[PDB]
Amino acid sequence: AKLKNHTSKNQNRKDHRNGIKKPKKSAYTSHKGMCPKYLRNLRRSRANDPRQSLRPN
Amino acid sequence: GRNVAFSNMRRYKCTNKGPNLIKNWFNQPA
Amino acid sequence: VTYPAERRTFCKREGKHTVHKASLYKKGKDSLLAQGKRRYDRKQRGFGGQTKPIFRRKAKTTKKQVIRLTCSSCKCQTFQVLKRCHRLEISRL
RNA sequence: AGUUCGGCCAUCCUACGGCGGAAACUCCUUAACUCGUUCCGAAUUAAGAAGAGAAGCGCCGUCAGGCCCCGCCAGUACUGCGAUCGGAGACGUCGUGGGAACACGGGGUGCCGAACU
RNA sequence: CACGCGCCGCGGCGAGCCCGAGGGAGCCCCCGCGGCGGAGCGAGCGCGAGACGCCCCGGGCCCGCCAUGCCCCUGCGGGCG
RNA sequence: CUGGUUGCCUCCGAAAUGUCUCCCAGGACAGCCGCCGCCCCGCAGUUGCGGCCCGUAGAGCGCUGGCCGGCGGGAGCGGGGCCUCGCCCGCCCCCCAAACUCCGAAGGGCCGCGCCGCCCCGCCGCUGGCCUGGGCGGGGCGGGCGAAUGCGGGCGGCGCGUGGGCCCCUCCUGGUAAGCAGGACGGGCGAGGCGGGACGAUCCGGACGCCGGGCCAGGGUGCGCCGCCGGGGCCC
RNA sequence: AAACACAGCGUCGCGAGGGCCGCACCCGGCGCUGGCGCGACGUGAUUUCUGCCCAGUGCCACGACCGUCACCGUGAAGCGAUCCGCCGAAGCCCUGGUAAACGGCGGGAGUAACUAUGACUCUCUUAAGGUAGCCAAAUGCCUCGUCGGGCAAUUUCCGACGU
RNA sequence: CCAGCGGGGCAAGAAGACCCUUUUGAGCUUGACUCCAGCCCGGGCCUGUGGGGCGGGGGCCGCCGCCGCCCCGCUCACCCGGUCGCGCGGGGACCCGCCCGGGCGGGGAGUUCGGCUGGGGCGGCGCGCCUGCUACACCGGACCGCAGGCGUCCCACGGCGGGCUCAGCGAGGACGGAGACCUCCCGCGGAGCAGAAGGGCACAAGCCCGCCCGACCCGCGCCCCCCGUGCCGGCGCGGGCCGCGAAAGCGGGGCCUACCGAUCCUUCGCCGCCCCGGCCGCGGGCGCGGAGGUGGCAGAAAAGUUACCACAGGGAUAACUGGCUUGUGGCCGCCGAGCGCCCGCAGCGACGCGGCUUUUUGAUCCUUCGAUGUCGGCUCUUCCUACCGUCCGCGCGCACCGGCGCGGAAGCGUCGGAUUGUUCACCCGUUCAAGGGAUC
Ligand SMILES: [K+]
Ligand SMILES: [K+]
Ligand SMILES: [K+]
Ligand SMILES: [K+]
Ligand SMILES: [K+]
Ligand SMILES: [K+]
Ligand SMILES: [K+]
Ligand SMILES: [K+]
Ligand SMILES: [K+]
Ligand SMILES: [K+]
Ligand SMILES: [K+]
Ligand SMILES: [Mg+2]
Ligand SMILES: [Mg+2]
Ligand SMILES: [Mg+2]
Ligand SMILES: [Mg+2]
Ligand SMILES: [Mg+2]
Ligand SMILES: [Mg+2]
Ligand SMILES: [Mg+2]
Ligand SMILES: [Mg+2]
Ligand SMILES: [Mg+2]
Ligand SMILES: [Mg+2]
Ligand SMILES: [Mg+2]
Ligand SMILES: [Mg+2]
Ligand SMILES: [Mg+2]
Ligand SMILES: [Mg+2]
Ligand SMILES: [Mg+2]
Ligand SMILES: [Mg+2]
Ligand SMILES: [Mg+2]
Ligand SMILES: [Mg+2]
Ligand SMILES: [Mg+2]
Ligand SMILES: [Mg+2]
Ligand SMILES: [Mg+2]
Ligand SMILES: [Mg+2]
Ligand SMILES: [Mg+2]
Ligand SMILES: [Mg+2]
Ligand SMILES: [Mg+2]
Ligand SMILES: [Mg+2]
Ligand SMILES: [Mg+2]
Ligand SMILES: [Mg+2]
Ligand SMILES: [Mg+2]
Ligand code: NA
Ligand code: NA
Ligand code: NA
Ligand code: NA
Ligand code: NA
Ligand code: NA
Ligand code: NA
Ligand code: NA
Ligand code: NA
Ligand code: NA
């Protein structure tokens, strides 16, 4: 008793049913895989800037 | 996808035969 | 495959490179007071026969050989894993 | 015009003839020193200045091979969409869009940039 | 239908909340502990949170676990990074 | 695993696929769908314009292989009678390839189509020979909404059914073939009433509340059976 | 029914403190028995016969204790739990016996005055290479084998033949 | 409406007994796997009272108290026999019993006996991975599709630096030849780079030489397959320590695409923590990382048989009718190399090409497993024509007789026997004896 092995017949219609979802607008600015030396320098420059430092007083 | 916490209740014992393991409280006022 | 008798390698205890001596690692003898052994011995008492599975469908014909390296200045032990091979010789200095 | 260092990597390559050097590059001369060749100062390393355009190099030529551009090949081959269009089929046709290749003919044959003479 | 688990809606109170068993001779009235919540992380000895914000997302800092540099009291202890 | 599972109306509405499974008449996770919401941040199964990618049809024999002959040169070698055909070198020529390609479409895929320009200032524990860079911010000046067409968008929670599919068009593979077996873009039946194709789940039209009137798609207009004539040609 | 039984034939075990069987225990049966007996198996009246193989598996040695193979016991070490040695019953291993135990029982070449065949030779090879007999049999695929008998005519039947 | 009849109602009678599946059974077997009675063997207790031998605590002598094994008495335990206990025996501290230990043990018990699959079985392994094609120019894409490969090999066949250029054509050197070795020339790779195939590579990724061990330690992220989970493999980084090189640089193995493995348990390694009334020493456990393996490769511990048999189901799936197909079987056209004394066609007709049929057998699996009674013969009816005799025409290599070919034509005829269940076949005979269909 053999049954079907494979079909992609209806798959493109199912994909378009609710549109093709775009990624989130925060995935474009993640620090997920950035060079660590660059990230460390960015942190220290912000903290020492009086106009953008969040340190209290 | 079902996401539940697993139950930790034991299966019942001696339901149709054996000692009576059910206690009712209909006699509380009396 | 042939392996050198001596190798200059990183030493964790002293934190630098030093000369090490090569040897072969073998499994030790089974103890009778390990917790798993105690549990197994307790479970096999009495009637009932065998209580745990016994493996019988071997497939591989080799093993992964392990070399033991002994630091010659501090007695720190290290291990290196070779790929699968059929016979291995350590050269003699 | 030359040399050093480069960019793009044949319109710059390959073969065969010819022209040229003041300066430059090159070929050239020597083996104490330095360094060197499975053996060899051939190569390479060091030290020179008697010779030379004979090569390399720059330029010219060839009904040259190659490489590059334009035409023709040809709206042909093939093809997207529509057709109760023809045909037993194999295949073809019409409408509406896109559109080659080989071959052949004509022409061409390095520029650009920074420093010195 | 009973018990257990997840999520949603509604009522009461709210850093709190709660007819437990039981006792007062009042099916419905009065009194009535745990518990859960309030602080986490760590195998464990244990150590232990403030810095920003209508809301949401994200950054930035802080606590625990792991690893390091400098200083010092009561010291394999404390502090700062 | 087989059989059965009891009132009405209204609003929405599938899947027969991917991975794992002592899995193949079953399940879990994902997809498709319903309900419940919450928030306020421009969207698109389309064309146009601009950048980049692919090696299929066709074409061809330069590469890797294969394959008919014709004619010339002979250093060397062989057959045969210093001669005469052969191997070799050159040109010409017939026919080829899912696992050949110097060339190469139609066709597809990805990205872009509003903020810009000038000046000055601050921080860095990164980077540079330096007064170099890069990154992140602040302050002033000028300018402005720069393809078409259509149209509001985004996110979360809980949960069901399904996981035997089949047919048409065009494109393929195995097989002598098959209403055979296995794949691909789009559509349909499943789960789509109505008219036509005499007759059919799928073909040609058209996708549905209950009615009156009008117009007419597809298909037809001797009689059964609603609806026809005129003109040109052929004719067992 | 061609199946079972059967008389006959053969093998095996046991001398009582034994053998075989029952049975939870206590106790039982054969047995009111004693080898001309009891129990366990195979073949199946008479006649005539019953070939070779102990490599395999099985069974048996009042054969042997070689190696291995328990608890117990005993020696050393240790704070003790423990650990390491020695000791070594049966069994297996070893050496033999046994087929009316289970069972098994070969290939290729050459060769005699026509041809044909092959008494004969060579060669590989086994634990042993199917003996006396019998046969297209209730057992032969090819096969409805070939020859003879019987029939007008026979895939049936009978007699022969046999790698 | 009646007497009859047996063509239909796939007539009735039964949740197919054949076949397949289900992580549904049972009977039986054994050299399946896990065991149990029973039996054999050893030690100890039951269990007294005496004697003796041996072996262990250069030569022994041992103390007579230490340790083992062994042997021989006695009777009082214990056991057996005879007797109406009328005028008596036999064994014996062994046996038996009980405890622990070893062996034998289908006599008995429980349980298992994979999957895919043009039905199942036999066979094979697209059951984990890799190259090219199938595949129709992004990506993806099936088959028991095509041609193949993997479960390894290497302390150098690895890292780095330097230097060099390979295969080969042509020409020359000669004991020397179709090839040894030497030299020059030109040489886009036609060589080599561990093993499949496809890519890549020239002052190199190839060959030779020098020095080395980055084939290291700590911690993160991404890509491929993909549910955007795991596993194998790869890549990009932050620190530590190193190798080579003048230096810039490069180096987490063999140029790239394959070469491998969870939980539980065991074993090993560094540094620490716990053993809960305390402290100390052994021992146990715990946090991190390797190794021991599951190839049916996301990973149960597993042999047969049923013709005595089942259970739940299945036309999701075989065996018999029917349907589509026509390779094979059967029938029929076209062509004309030749045969035929000569003479392609009176009669034949090679090499090739085009059709038809469903009276053979295959291929497939659409309908039917809560059943359509499965071969042949006997009996009886009807139908086809692709015509064997008889009818009517024509042709001949047709004198007559007898034959052969073609067209129309389905009315009648197509038989009796021996052997075989046979259809078929084969033989004897005769008025000389076609072929088929209708649920074969
Ligand atoms: K499945
Ligand atoms: K070619
Ligand atoms: K007998
Ligand atoms: K024997
Ligand atoms: K026989
Ligand atoms: K006869
Ligand atoms: K099938
Ligand atoms: K039988
Ligand atoms: K039938
Ligand atoms: K025909
Ligand atoms: K049936
Ligand atoms: Mg499926
Ligand atoms: Mg709707
Ligand atoms: Mg499994
Ligand atoms: Mg082509
Ligand atoms: Mg299903
Ligand atoms: Mg079909
Ligand atoms: Mg349905
Ligand atoms: Mg529809
Ligand atoms: Mg009318
Ligand atoms: Mg004989
Ligand atoms: Mg015979
Ligand atoms: Mg006979
Ligand atoms: Mg007979
Ligand atoms: Mg007869
Ligand atoms: Mg009747
Ligand atoms: Mg009837
Ligand atoms: Mg049934
Ligand atoms: Mg039944
Ligand atoms: Mg199953
Ligand atoms: Mg069973
Ligand atoms: Mg059994
Ligand atoms: Mg199966
Ligand atoms: Mg898989
Ligand atoms: Mg180099
Ligand atoms: Mg580093
Ligand atoms: Mg698996
Ligand atoms: Mg019937
Ligand atoms: Mg019936
Ligand atoms: Mg006719
Ligand atoms: Na137990
Ligand atoms: Na926040
Ligand atoms: Na209709
Ligand atoms: Na007798
Ligand atoms: Na036998
Ligand atoms: Na039974
Ligand atoms: Na891999
Ligand atoms: Na079917
Ligand atoms: Na038929
Ligand atoms: Na029939």
PDB file of N, CA and C (backbone and C1' of nucleotides) in Angstrom, chain F residues 82-105:
ATOM      1  C5'   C F  82      66.218   4.557 -56.473  1.00  0.00           C
ATOM      2  C4'   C F  82      65.086   3.993 -57.296  1.00  0.00           C
ATOM      3  C3'   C F  82      63.672   4.273 -56.803  1.00  0.00           C
ATOM      4  O3'   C F  82      63.202   5.556 -57.176  1.00  0.00           O
ATOM      5  C1'   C F  82      63.887   1.976 -57.365  1.00  0.00           C
ATOM      6  P     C F  83      61.657   5.954 -56.965  1.00  0.00           P
ATOM      7  O5'   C F  83      60.878   5.078 -58.043  1.00  0.00           O
ATOM      8  C5'   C F  83      59.455   5.114 -58.122  1.00  0.00           C
ATOM      9  C4'   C F  83      58.889   3.789 -58.572  1.00  0.00           C
ATOM     10  C3'   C F  83      57.375   3.646 -58.425  1.00  0.00           C
ATOM     11  O3'   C F  83      56.837   2.878 -59.501  1.00  0.00           O
ATOM     12  C1'   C F  83      58.457   1.977 -57.148  1.00  0.00           C
ATOM     13  P     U F  84      55.264   2.955 -59.822  1.00  0.00           P
ATOM     14  O5'   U F  84      54.580   2.705 -58.404  1.00  0.00           O
ATOM     15  C5'   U F  84      53.402   3.400 -58.022  1.00  0.00           C
ATOM     16  C4'   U F  84      52.556   2.572 -57.089  1.00  0.00           C
ATOM     17  C3'   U F  84      51.884   3.322 -55.951  1.00  0.00           C
ATOM     18  O3'   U F  84      50.694   3.976 -56.357  1.00  0.00           O
ATOM     19  C1'   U F  84      52.878   1.334 -55.126  1.00  0.00           C
ATOM     20  P     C F  85      49.775   4.726 -55.276  1.00  0.00           P
ATOM     21  O5'   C F  85      49.069   3.543 -54.479  1.00  0.00           O
ATOM     22  C5'   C F  85      48.177   3.826 -53.412  1.00  0.00           C
ATOM     23  C4'   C F  85      47.967   2.629 -52.521  1.00  0.00           C
ATOM     24  C3'   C F  85      47.666   2.946 -51.065  1.00  0.00           C
ATOM     25  O3'   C F  85      46.298   3.253 -50.849  1.00  0.00           O
ATOM     26  C1'   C F  85      49.368   1.309 -51.174  1.00  0.00           C
ATOM     27  P     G F  86      45.665   3.163 -49.375  1.00  0.00           P
ATOM     28  O5'   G F  86      46.847   3.640 -48.428  1.00  0.00           O
ATOM     29  C5'   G F  86      46.589   4.038 -47.094  1.00  0.00           C
ATOM     30  C4'   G F  86      47.134   3.033 -46.115  1.00  0.00           C
ATOM     31  C3'   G F  86      47.640   3.600 -44.799  1.00  0.00           C
ATOM     32  O3'   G F  86      46.600   3.820 -43.860  1.00  0.00           O
ATOM     33  C1'   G F  86      49.267   2.151 -45.698  1.00  0.00           C
ATOM     34  P     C F  87      46.346   5.287 -43.250  1.00  0.00           P
ATOM     35  O5'   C F  87      47.240   5.314 -41.932  1.00  0.00           O
ATOM     36  C5'   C F  87      47.070   4.334 -40.921  1.00  0.00           C
ATOM     37  C4'   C F  87      48.306   4.193 -40.067  1.00  0.00           C
ATOM     38  C3'   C F  87      48.789   5.455 -39.369  1.00  0.00           C
ATOM     39  O3'   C F  87      48.062   5.758 -38.192  1.00  0.00           O
ATOM     40  C1'   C F  87      50.623   4.365 -40.381  1.00  0.00           C
ATOM     41  P     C F  88      47.855   7.286 -37.735  1.00  0.00           P
ATOM     42  O5'   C F  88      49.333   7.837 -37.504  1.00  0.00           O
ATOM     43  C5'   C F  88      49.549   9.164 -37.042  1.00  0.00           C
ATOM     44  C4'   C F  88      50.859   9.730 -37.535  1.00  0.00           C
ATOM     45  C3'   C F  88      50.807  11.172 -38.020  1.00  0.00           C
ATOM     46  O3'   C F  88      50.903  12.104 -36.958  1.00  0.00           O
ATOM     47  C1'   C F  88      51.984   9.836 -39.592  1.00  0.00           C
ATOM     48  P     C F  89      49.755  13.204 -36.730  1.00  0.00           P
ATOM     49  O5'   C F  89      50.124  14.358 -37.758  1.00  0.00           O
ATOM     50  C5'   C F  89      51.263  15.173 -37.547  1.00  0.00           C
ATOM     51  C4'   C F  89      51.530  16.064 -38.730  1.00  0.00           C
ATOM     52  C3'   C F  89      50.339  16.846 -39.255  1.00  0.00           C
ATOM     53  O3'   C F  89      50.064  18.009 -38.500  1.00  0.00           O
ATOM     54  C1'   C F  89      51.468  15.837 -41.061  1.00  0.00           C
ATOM     55  P     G F  90      48.556  18.537 -38.364  1.00  0.00           P
ATOM     56  O5'   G F  90      48.241  19.181 -39.787  1.00  0.00           O
ATOM     57  C5'   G F  90      49.017  20.262 -40.283  1.00  0.00           C
ATOM     58  C4'   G F  90      48.594  20.663 -41.674  1.00  0.00           C
ATOM     59  C3'   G F  90      47.102  20.826 -41.903  1.00  0.00           C
ATOM     60  O3'   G F  90      46.591  22.056 -41.423  1.00  0.00           O
ATOM     61  C1'   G F  90      48.038  19.586 -43.680  1.00  0.00           C
ATOM     62  P     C F  91      45.068  22.148 -40.924  1.00  0.00           P
ATOM     63  O5'   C F  91      44.224  22.226 -42.270  1.00  0.00           O
ATOM     64  C5'   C F  91      44.422  23.285 -43.192  1.00  0.00           C
ATOM     65  C4'   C F  91      43.816  22.967 -44.535  1.00  0.00           C
ATOM     66  C3'   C F  91      42.321  22.702 -44.555  1.00  0.00           C
ATOM     67  O3'   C F  91      41.546  23.888 -44.546  1.00  0.00           O
ATOM     68  C1'   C F  91      43.433  21.052 -45.824  1.00  0.00           C
ATOM     69  P     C F  92      40.060  23.875 -43.943  1.00  0.00           P
ATOM     70  O5'   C F  92      39.277  22.849 -44.872  1.00  0.00           O
ATOM     71  C5'   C F  92      38.959  23.196 -46.208  1.00  0.00           C
ATOM     72  C4'   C F  92      38.259  22.080 -46.933  1.00  0.00           C
ATOM     73  C3'   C F  92      36.979  21.563 -46.306  1.00  0.00           C
ATOM     74  O3'   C F  92      35.867  22.407 -46.532  1.00  0.00           O
ATOM     75  C1'   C F  92      38.302  19.746 -47.020  1.00  0.00           C
ATOM     76  P     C F  93      34.667  22.461 -45.470  1.00  0.00           P
ATOM     77  O5'   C F  93      33.999  21.020 -45.566  1.00  0.00           O
ATOM     78  C5'   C F  93      33.407  20.573 -46.775  1.00  0.00           C
ATOM     79  C4'   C F  93      33.058  19.108 -46.718  1.00  0.00           C
ATOM     80  C3'   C F  93      32.104  18.685 -45.616  1.00  0.00           C
ATOM     81  O3'   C F  93      30.750  18.955 -45.925  1.00  0.00           O
ATOM     82  C1'   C F  93      33.919  17.182 -45.706  1.00  0.00           C
ATOM     83  P     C F  94      29.658  19.057 -44.754  1.00  0.00           P
ATOM     84  O5'   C F  94      29.201  17.553 -44.526  1.00  0.00           O
ATOM     85  C5'   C F  94      28.440  16.868 -45.508  1.00  0.00           C
ATOM     86  C4'   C F  94      27.961  15.536 -44.997  1.00  0.00           C
ATOM     87  C3'   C F  94      27.244  15.559 -43.661  1.00  0.00           C
ATOM     88  O3'   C F  94      25.889  15.952 -43.761  1.00  0.00           O
ATOM     89  C1'   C F  94      28.848  13.840 -43.648  1.00  0.00           C
ATOM     90  P     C F  95      25.245  16.895 -42.636  1.00  0.00           P
ATOM     91  O5'   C F  95      25.140  15.950 -41.365  1.00  0.00           O
ATOM     92  C5'   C F  95      24.477  14.702 -41.450  1.00  0.00           C
ATOM     93  C4'   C F  95      24.730  13.847 -40.239  1.00  0.00           C
ATOM     94  C3'   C F  95      24.484  14.495 -38.892  1.00  0.00           C
ATOM     95  O3'   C F  95      23.111  14.567 -38.558  1.00  0.00           O
ATOM     96  C1'   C F  95      26.520  13.301 -38.833  1.00  0.00           C
ATOM     97  P     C F  96      22.630  15.460 -37.318  1.00  0.00           P
ATOM     98  O5'   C F  96      23.224  14.686 -36.062  1.00  0.00           O
ATOM     99  C5'   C F  96      23.621  15.364 -34.881  1.00  0.00           C
ATOM    100  C4'   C F  96      24.201  14.393 -33.888  1.00  0.00           C
ATOM    101  C3'   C F  96      24.300  14.870 -32.453  1.00  0.00           C
ATOM    102  O3'   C F  96      23.061  14.796 -31.772  1.00  0.00           O
ATOM    103  C1'   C F  96      26.302  13.773 -33.077  1.00  0.00           C
ATOM    104  P     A F  97      22.640  15.918 -30.708  1.00  0.00           P
ATOM    105  O5'   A F  97      23.324  15.432 -29.362  1.00  0.00           O
ATOM    106  C5'   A F  97      23.079  14.135 -28.848  1.00  0.00           C
ATOM    107  C4'   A F  97      23.823  13.902 -27.560  1.00  0.00           C
ATOM    108  C3'   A F  97      23.852  15.068 -26.590  1.00  0.00           C
ATOM    109  O3'   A F  97      22.665  15.149 -25.823  1.00  0.00           O
ATOM    110  C1'   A F  97      26.020  14.132 -26.791  1.00  0.00           C
ATOM    111  P     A F  98      22.117  16.546 -25.263  1.00  0.00           P
ATOM    112  O5'   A F  98      22.071  16.325 -23.689  1.00  0.00           O
ATOM    113  C5'   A F  98      21.535  15.130 -23.135  1.00  0.00           C
ATOM    114  C4'   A F  98      21.540  15.153 -21.626  1.00  0.00           C
ATOM    115  C3'   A F  98      22.836  14.750 -20.939  1.00  0.00           C
ATOM    116  O3'   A F  98      23.732  15.841 -20.835  1.00  0.00           O
ATOM    117  C1'   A F  98      20.949  13.765 -19.849  1.00  0.00           C
ATOM    118  P     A F  99      25.225  15.773 -21.410  1.00  0.00           P
ATOM    119  O5'   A F  99      26.124  15.454 -20.144  1.00  0.00           O
ATOM    120  C5'   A F  99      25.982  16.176 -18.929  1.00  0.00           C
ATOM    121  C4'   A F  99      26.483  15.367 -17.764  1.00  0.00           C
ATOM    122  C3'   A F  99      27.715  14.523 -18.039  1.00  0.00           C
ATOM    123  O3'   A F  99      28.912  15.277 -17.918  1.00  0.00           O
ATOM    124  C1'   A F  99      26.068  13.214 -16.938  1.00  0.00           C
ATOM    125  P     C F 100      30.140  15.091 -18.942  1.00  0.00           P
ATOM    126  O5'   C F 100      29.690  15.801 -20.296  1.00  0.00           O
ATOM    127  C5'   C F 100      29.578  17.214 -20.400  1.00  0.00           C
ATOM    128  C4'   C F 100      30.440  17.784 -21.505  1.00  0.00           C
ATOM    129  C3'   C F 100      30.376  19.294 -21.665  1.00  0.00           C
ATOM    130  O3'   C F 100      31.223  19.955 -20.745  1.00  0.00           O
ATOM    131  C1'   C F 100      30.256  18.246 -23.795  1.00  0.00           C
ATOM    132  P     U F 101      30.760  21.294 -20.005  1.00  0.00           P
ATOM    133  O5'   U F 101      30.966  22.433 -21.094  1.00  0.00           O
ATOM    134  C5'   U F 101      32.234  22.654 -21.696  1.00  0.00           C
ATOM    135  C4'   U F 101      32.168  23.724 -22.756  1.00  0.00           C
ATOM    136  C3'   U F 101      31.661  25.083 -22.281  1.00  0.00           C
ATOM    137  O3'   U F 101      32.326  26.115 -23.003  1.00  0.00           O
ATOM    138  C1'   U F 101      30.265  24.284 -24.003  1.00  0.00           C
ATOM    139  P     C F 102      33.322  27.138 -22.272  1.00  0.00           P
ATOM    140  O5'   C F 102      33.362  28.374 -23.274  1.00  0.00           O
ATOM    141  C5'   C F 102      34.537  29.141 -23.452  1.00  0.00           C
ATOM    142  C4'   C F 102      34.532  29.882 -24.763  1.00  0.00           C
ATOM    143  C3'   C F 102      33.330  30.765 -25.047  1.00  0.00           C
ATOM    144  O3'   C F 102      33.353  32.003 -24.370  1.00  0.00           O
ATOM    145  C1'   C F 102      33.813  29.494 -26.958  1.00  0.00           C
ATOM    146  P     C F 103      32.059  32.504 -23.565  1.00  0.00           P
ATOM    147  O5'   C F 103      30.885  32.534 -24.644  1.00  0.00           O
ATOM    148  C5'   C F 103      30.951  33.394 -25.769  1.00  0.00           C
ATOM    149  C4'   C F 103      29.729  33.304 -26.655  1.00  0.00           C
ATOM    150  C3'   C F 103      28.402  33.724 -26.056  1.00  0.00           C
ATOM    151  O3'   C F 103      28.266  35.128 -25.946  1.00  0.00           O
ATOM    152  C1'   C F 103      28.116  31.804 -27.426  1.00  0.00           C
ATOM    153  P     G F 104      27.346  35.767 -24.798  1.00  0.00           P
ATOM    154  O5'   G F 104      25.933  35.069 -24.998  1.00  0.00           O
ATOM    155  C5'   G F 104      25.109  35.363 -26.114  1.00  0.00           C
ATOM    156  C4'   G F 104      23.832  34.573 -26.061  1.00  0.00           C
ATOM    157  C3'   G F 104      23.090  34.616 -24.740  1.00  0.00           C
ATOM    158  O3'   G F 104      22.340  35.802 -24.565  1.00  0.00           O
ATOM    159  C1'   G F 104      23.218  32.386 -25.483  1.00  0.00           C
ATOM    160  P     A F 105      21.832  36.227 -23.109  1.00  0.00           P
ATOM    161  O5'   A F 105      20.501  35.374 -22.913  1.00  0.00           O
ATOM    162  C5'   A F 105      19.228  35.991 -22.822  1.00  0.00           C
ATOM    163  C4'   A F 105      18.469  35.910 -24.121  1.00  0.00           C
ATOM    164  C3'   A F 105      16.964  36.058 -24.011  1.00  0.00           C
ATOM    165  O3'   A F 105      16.537  37.400 -23.903  1.00  0.00           O
ATOM    166  C1'   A F 105      17.456  34.196 -25.356  1.00  0.00           C
TER     167        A F 105
END
